[PDB]
């Protein structure tokens, strides 16, 4: 039933804020927290993301976190800043100079106990808590370092609940920060062990989409985020409206994660203009529309979830989804029959008349981790910048463990990509 949301850090609170901006509109929730919608399908499963405060006020079951206050006052001063429960704002001061260690062990640990207090306040209220979803970046320090801390702290208190994450992978094409290949490899080391399902948001992909496809001369962060929000609203449609397929976080994981470690998803969206059903289908399976910088045709799909939103012919969707599987039969592993599922939601997303959201667990995702590992080992073979971490009391072995563990994940993806039937 209920999901508890947690946004952490600069990137985390930005994408987190936009996410609420968007779905609040879909459910007809204004910045004050009142309902002014037409359809009753909107309030059918509103409880999943909203608490019903006194005076029929809908309040995002969300927790905002950071080590600098600079991003969070922008949120509270933002269009929807007042919709949030002001108590759920939990920000430090000492900050984190994009140091993963400060977020995880040092600067984040004094604040971790205060965040967890807020989680318990929201969790105790849940009729039936299904789990948590997190928004954060893996290049920074707070969202990356402290986010992974928070996951671990929450897990040992809610070990039978689902842990979901919208993790933003760093790319040089968006940030000149040099230590990002370190922050990511360190957090990924945590994600493989402590999250049940992880949506990979790749900045290299978000930029390339914006520049190449959207022809944005100079893409802003808000431009990238407009893609992220469209994606997040897409992959959570089944969670938020009365439906059949993947209606909760657990049923999604059961359908999407064949092996506990390989739970890193390649989300896709169409149309990416920012329009027919056969066109939507082909697009959402195309390399260009992938929100992770990976060619799926360089690997095989383990599992796939497709969500078609808007008023369209369900026969057509069925015929087309069978079309793409038949024609691209080679790119779906034989040893998992019927690995592709399809949802259809009547309510189109704001602006569009119909959209298609894609979610794929592909072994082609290994392309994304390899890029980070090349950026990682190039700096680490020389022991560069390690003083920022060891200074915080860390150990150089913990880097190797993080390195080798991340390399194992890639092998595991290649293993099942090369597997055969009989």
């Amino acid at each position: 039933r209920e999901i508890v949301h947690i946004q952490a850090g600069q990137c985390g609170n930005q994408i987190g804020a936009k996410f609420w901006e968007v779905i609040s509109d879909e459910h007809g929730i204004d910045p004050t927290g009142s309902y002014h919608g037409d359809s009753d399908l909107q309030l059918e499963r509103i409880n999943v993301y909203y608490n019903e405060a006194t005076g029929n006020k809908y309040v995002p079951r969300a927790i905002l976190v950071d080590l600098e206050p600079g991003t969070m006052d922008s949120v509270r001063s933002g269009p929807f800043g007042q919709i949030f429960r002001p108590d759920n704002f939990v920000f430090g001061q000492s900050g984190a100079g994009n140091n993963w260690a400060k977020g995880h062990y040092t600067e984040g640990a004094e604040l971790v106990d205060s965040v967890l207090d807020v989680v318990r306040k929201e969790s105790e209220s849940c009729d039936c808590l299904q789990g948590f979803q997190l928004t954060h970046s893996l290049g920074g320090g707070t969202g990356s370092g402290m986010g992974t801390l928070l996951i671990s702290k929450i897990r040992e208190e809610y070990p039978d609940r689902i842990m979901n994450t919208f993790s933003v992978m760093p790319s040089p094409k968006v940030s000149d920060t040099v230590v990002e290949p370190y922050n990511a490899t360190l957090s990924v080391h945590q994600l493989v062990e402590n999250t049940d399902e992880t949506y990979c948001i790749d900045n290299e992909a978000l930029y390339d989409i914006c520049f190449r496809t959207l022809k944005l001369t100079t893409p802003t962060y808000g431009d990238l985020n407009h893609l992220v929000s469209a994606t997040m609203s897409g992959v959570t449609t089944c969670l938020r409206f009365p439906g059949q397929l993947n209606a909760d976080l657990r049923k999604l994981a059961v359908n999407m994660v064949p092996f506990p470690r390989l739970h890193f998803f390649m989300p896709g969206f169409a149309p990416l203009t920012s329009l027919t059903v056969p066109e939507l289908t082909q697009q959402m399976f195309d390399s260009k529309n992938m929100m992770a910088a990976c060619d799926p045709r360089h690997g095989r799909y383990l599992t796939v979830a497709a969500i078609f939103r808007g008023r369209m012919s369900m026969k057509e969707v069925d015929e087309q989804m069978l079309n793409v599987q038949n024609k691209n039969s080679s790119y779906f592993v034989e040893w998992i029959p019927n690995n592709v599922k399809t949802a259809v939601c009547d309510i189109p997303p704001r602006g569009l008349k119909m959209s298609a959201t894609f979610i794929g667990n592909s072994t082609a995702i290994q392309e994304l981790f390899k890029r980070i590992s090349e950026q990682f080992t190039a700096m680490f073979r020389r022991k560069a910048f390690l003083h920022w971490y060891t200074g915080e009391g860390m150990d150089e072995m913990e880097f190797t463990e993080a390195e080798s563990n991340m390399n194992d994940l890639v092998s595991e993806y290649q293993q099942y990509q090369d597997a055969t039937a009989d």
């Binding site: 049923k251 994660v257 092996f259 599992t303 026969k315 040893w335 690995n339 099942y416 039937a421």
Partner: protein, 440 residues
């Protein structure tokens, strides 16, 4: 006397339960508020419809049923639906968190939290019976509740009721409307666990029903409401002998005697006719001879098997409506001539026939034409084993790589329980092969 308690487990079980009890009500002239103007026996009765319906002082006719689900959404719609007044609240039992398409959760983690309550409510219904005949259990093969909890309940029912009959209506998974990738797993597990606890199980292949809806009713993309309304007609045919009675009526237990040659060979193939639209049925009336022929057309089968490539071990015909012995006898004579229909050498070749003069009714806004006469054939053919085979192959492909197995182990199951279940299925396919062989 000879009461029958229905148990509807999980979404499929419940929703099919809605269609069935709605239809039953229309067949017996029972209003959605339970009142039945026909029945003059107030507060009690010995009539045929009393095997499925109890009576109250208020003159209210109450289904001898229980709806169980580990999550409230589906049953909630019943509680608030058109036939809300028909039931007593204690008959509608909901959890909070479902089994997440996980057999383990349905049988253990979540199921154990509610099994006692369900049995307590089942028990309370049994106490209303002057002579309980047994239970009918509606469930899906693919769901976590439909598979896991059903097995748990059936095991518990064997203990609490010994060897009173337990019949299944099992929804066999189809890709066109599958909700989980692991439905093959759940299927093999529930089938194995329930096998020695079920006396007779009618498998409903969704792909078959999907096909029939598309072909015979010209439904573009069939919904659950579409499939259920067709399924209900078939269930109604099978239970007609229990709910009505006439001179030509043959009790379902008599059919059961012919259909089950060995305790494990208890999966009859259902084939129903006529499935026809109102447009096609207009000005075109189907004879006893015509519908009888359809029963041997695999397009009308409820499971996708090929009886031609298999051998017959029994043939029952459950007629209802405008059917006379004369026409039936002549109809089967034709088929004895116009088909070949091979039987195993150890079985006789007669067809056990039953007739209920009460004609088929149809639900309003329904897709099916209202016909004067209809028939359901129950056959025990080796071809049904094809259903196990397709499912066992799907199972084999995933377990070979232990795909998804971790979701099951995490809830407490073992790999041994998997290989064990799979071995039983291998034995069952082998059994269904053994019976087909000729004697020496």
């Amino acid at each position: 006397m000879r009461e029958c308690i229905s148990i509807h487990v999980g979404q499929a079980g419940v929703q099919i339960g809605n269609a069935c009890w709605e239809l039953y009500c229309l067949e017996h002239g029972i209003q959605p508020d339970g009142q039945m103007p026909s029945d003059k026996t107030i507060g009690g009765g010995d009539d045929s419809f009393n095997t499925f319906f109890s009576e109250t002082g208020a003159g209210k006719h109450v289904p001898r049923a229980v709806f169980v689900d580990l999550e409230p959404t589906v049953i909630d719609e019943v509680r608030t639906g058109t036939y809300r007044q028909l039931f007593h609240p204690e008959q509608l039992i909901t959890g909070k968190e479902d089994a997440a398409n996980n057999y383990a959760r349905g049988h253990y983690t979540i199921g154990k939290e509610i099994i006692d309550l369900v049995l307590d409510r089942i028990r309370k219904l049994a106490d209303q019976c002057t002579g309980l005949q047994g239970f009918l259990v509606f469930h899906s093969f693919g769901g976590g509740t439909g598979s896991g909890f059903t097995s748990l309940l059936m095991e518990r029912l064997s203990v609490d009721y010994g060897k009173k009959s337990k019949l299944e209506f099992s929804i066999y998974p189809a890709p066109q409307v599958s909700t989980a990738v692991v439905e093959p797993y759940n299927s093999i597990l529930t089938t194995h666990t329930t096998l020695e606890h079920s006396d007779c199980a009618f498998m409903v292949d969704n792909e078959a029903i999907y096909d029939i809806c598309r072909r015979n009713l010209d439904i573009e993309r069939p919904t659950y409401t579409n499939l259920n309304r067709l399924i209900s007609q078939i269930v109604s045919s099978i239970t007609a002998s229990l709910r009505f009675d006439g001179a030509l009526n043959v009790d379902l237990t008599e059919f059961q005697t012919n259909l089950v040659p060995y305790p494990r060979i208890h999966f009859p193939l259902a084939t129903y006719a006529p499935v026809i639209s109102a447009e096609k049925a207009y000005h075109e009336q189907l004879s006893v001879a015509e519908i009888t022929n359809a029963c041997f057309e695999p397009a009308n089968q409820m499971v996708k098997c090929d009886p031609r490539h298999g051998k017959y071990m029994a043939c029952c015909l459950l007629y209802r409506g405008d059917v006379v012995p004369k026409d039936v006898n002549a109809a089967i004579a034709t088929i004895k001539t116009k088909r070949s229909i091979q039987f195993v050498d150890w079985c006789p070749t007669g067809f056990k026939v039953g007739i209920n003069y009460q004609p088929p009714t149809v639900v309003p806004g329904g897709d099916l034409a209202k016909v004067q006469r209809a028939v359901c054939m129950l056959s025990n053919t080796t071809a049904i084993a094809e259903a196990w085979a397709r499912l066992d192959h799907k199972f084999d492909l995933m377990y070979a790589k232990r795909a998804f197995v971790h979701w099951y182990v995490g809830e407490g199951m073992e790999e041994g329980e998997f290989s064990e279940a799979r071995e039983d299925m291998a034995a069952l396919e082998k059994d269904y092969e053994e019976v087909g062989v000729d004697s020496v």
